[PDB]
Design a protein around this ligand. Structure first.
Ligand code: HEM
Length: 214
């Protein structure tokens, strides 16, 4: 379609379903997730968002990203820091795993944010809008499956405090995406990059599943 947001959604339908079909994610949906599994996914998210938000700040004033810059509404790094301090303890920075699959994702994020800025929107879109609109169902499952204490912490990642209405913010963000000016060629690369984002998540899930079944 003409609208980039609508174009992205349609192009990534296949891969998104592929992501839902991933073994690790299948179990997740079937309410089957363990503490070790959830810890691994949280650590992954921490690394992914550290890299993504590092690159967003580097290109926040660029006309190729500025229109979709919503730092207060979307930042997740601080939330994950809080969360990992719960899951891995006070020395979490020293013990959280940083696997090859995580490194491949982080590496693509830095390359994009450093040499192909116009493609950063593909990752911001995939991560932010994906986690926001899907957070509810993912958290619901997690908390009833993890049976954690009334600690009052460990899942801050699933709540975007600076966003009163998810649906409302989503349409705003989409509107801003469709306001972005880019050559047909770039537009194609952004759509491709979005598919690449899903592939990076899929290989991540495959790796985490592998680490948990020994
Ligand atoms: C537990 C597996 C998953 C399930 C069952 C799932 C579920 C959801 C739900 C409920 C929505 C909102 C409705 C919609 O699709 O429009 C959503 C949207 C989306 N998801 Fe997922 N998702 C999963 C994994 C992922 C992963 C791994 C990514 C990739 C980083 C992702 C990226 C997206 C994106 C970008 C959207 C927004 C699409 C749009 O409305 O334009 N999802 N997801």
């Amino acid at each position: 379609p003409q609208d980039l947001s609508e174009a992205l959604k349609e192009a990534t339908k296949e891969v998104h379903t592929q992501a839902e079909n991933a073994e690790f994610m299948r179990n997740f949906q079937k309410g089957q997730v363990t503490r070790d599994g959830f810890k691994l996914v949280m650590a992954s998210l921490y690394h992914i968002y550290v890299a993504l938000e590092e690159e967003i700040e580097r290109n926040k004033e660029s006309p190729v990203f500025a229109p979709v810059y919503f730092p207060e509404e979307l930042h997740r790094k601080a939330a994950l820091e809080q969360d990992l301090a719960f899951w891995y303890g006070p020395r979490w920075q020293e013990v959280i795993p940083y696997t090859p699959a995580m490194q491949r994702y982080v590496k693509r994020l830095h390359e994009v944010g450093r040499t192909e800025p116009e493609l950063l929107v593909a990752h911001a879109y995939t991560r932010y809008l994906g986690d926001l609109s899907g957070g509810q169902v993912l958290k619901k499952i997690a908390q009833k499956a993890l049976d954690l204490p009334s600690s009052g912490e460990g899942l801050a990642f699933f709540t975007f405090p600076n966003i009163a209405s998810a649906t409302k913010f989503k349409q705003l963000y989409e509107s801003r995406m469709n306001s972005l000016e880019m050559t047909p060629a770039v537009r194609q690369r952004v759509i491709e990059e979005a598919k690449t984002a899903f592939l990076l998540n899929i290989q991540l899930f495959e790796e985490l599943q592998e680490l948990l079944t020994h």
